[PDB]
Design a protein around this ligand. Structure first.
Ligand SMILES: O=c1cc[nH]c(=O)[nH]1
Ligand SMILES: [Cl-]
Length: 229
């Protein structure tokens, strides 16, 4: 699963491998960056085999994109799908608790049983971050190190598809993708990030899930079934 050693066709789903062809060298460079970090004595999250995990769900099937900032900084939380945690993790990360608070407020569903968001990924929600790795315990430590070109390419490719797309952009770094979503087949929702530092500035009450579904059906697409166990 090494980004430095193997090509996109062997790392990600077929549609994604084609979509990310323009950043093939950049992805290899990121693998070399992570190698250099480890040689220097610094770690990264998520685990190497999970870094590109969002791109293992089919490119063609994406209907909604959620974009955050960067992975969870606590070892054992980040799994390569933004905001998700393994089903045995608890307490939940604070931003996930905030996401779930808004989920219940918006949709009226019960609080989820755990923090595993794979059902969303399986239903065509792409769970991206603007930056795909972080040093443990150091939020935003890999900002500006080369991932932004990769996630820009992902968005640009999604937007070029002959398909509707609704994007939910959480926070400042995610919102730098908005210009790439300007085409008529794409709509973006942006809000403050669900982190405690920002959530009270406009994440709570933002109702992104029902808004995304209104947007999807307005484009002639089926809505996301957001319901989690
Ligand atoms: O994946 C994650 C987790 C925390 N914060 C983010 O922006 N994304
Ligand atoms: Cl932010």
């Amino acid at each position: 699963a090494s980004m430095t050693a193997r090509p996109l066709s062997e790392l990600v789903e077929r549609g994604w491998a084609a979509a990310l062809e323009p950043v093939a060298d950049q992805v290899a460079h990121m693998g070399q960056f992570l190698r250099a970090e480890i040689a220097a004595g610094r770690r990264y999250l998520p685990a190497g085999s999970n870094v590109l995990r969002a791109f293992t769900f089919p490119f063609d099937n994406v209907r909604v994109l959620i974009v955050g900032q960067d992975p969870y900084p606590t070892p054992g939380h980040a799994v390569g799908l933004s905001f998700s945690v393994a089903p045995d993790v608890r307490p939940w990360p604070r931003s996930l608790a905030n996401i779930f608070d808004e989920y219940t407020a918006d949709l009226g569903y019960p609080l989820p049983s755990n923090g595993d968001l794979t059902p969303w990924a399986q239903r065509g929600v792409l769970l991206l971050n603007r930056v795909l790795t972080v040093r443990p315990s150091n939020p935003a430590s890999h900002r500006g190190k080369g991932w932004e070109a990769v996630t820009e390419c992902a968005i640009r490719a999604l937007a070029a598809r002959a398909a509707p797309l609704v994007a939910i952009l959480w926070g400042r770094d995610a919102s730098t993708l908005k210009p790439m979503l300007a085409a008529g087949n794409c709509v973006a929702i942006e809000s403050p990030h669900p982190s405690p530092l920002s959530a009270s500035r406009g994440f709570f009450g933002s109702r992104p899930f029902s808004r995304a579904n209104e947007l999807l059906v307005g484009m002639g697409a089926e809505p996301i079934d957001w319901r989690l166990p």
